[PDB]
Amino acid sequence: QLQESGGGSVQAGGSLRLSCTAPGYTDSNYYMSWFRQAPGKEREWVAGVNTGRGSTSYADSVKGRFTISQDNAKNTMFLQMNSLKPEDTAIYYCAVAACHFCDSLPKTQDEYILWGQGTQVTVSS
């Protein structure tokens, strides 16, 4: 029951902005991460934000082209994806977990509690 939007197809070098909203999370601090999976591969962590600290982190394959930006509303985040390349084509998934210590952004699949459907991103040359 996450709200995800922004996916679609874009030419190579273009950009998209993925949006993710967690309805109950105006309370709490939380981890929110993006994972992606292309048909035939595992689901890799892409980027995430630790609202408890205020910090963001990125996988090396997207570092310098993907940035997370907060919203005025504290239960929503955006992933701005620039200079997209074909191998960024995949289903992108938002994931959220309420935060106790707010101690370190987790980078695997199984430590996140809430998941969306995923938005599909297709990059064509």
User: DSSP letters of 12-28?
Assistant: TT--EEEEEE-TTTTSS
Query: Solved how?
Result: X-ray
How many residues in the chain? 125
What would the two tokens of residue 47 be?
Answer: 């980027």
Resolution (in Å) of the shown entry?
2.7
Distance between CA atoms of residues 76 and 2, nearest Å = 10
Q: Say if CB 48 and CB 63 are below 8 A apart.
A: no
Q: Say if CB 84 and CB 16 are below 8 A apart.
A: yes
Other CB atoms within 10 A of residue 124 CB: 11
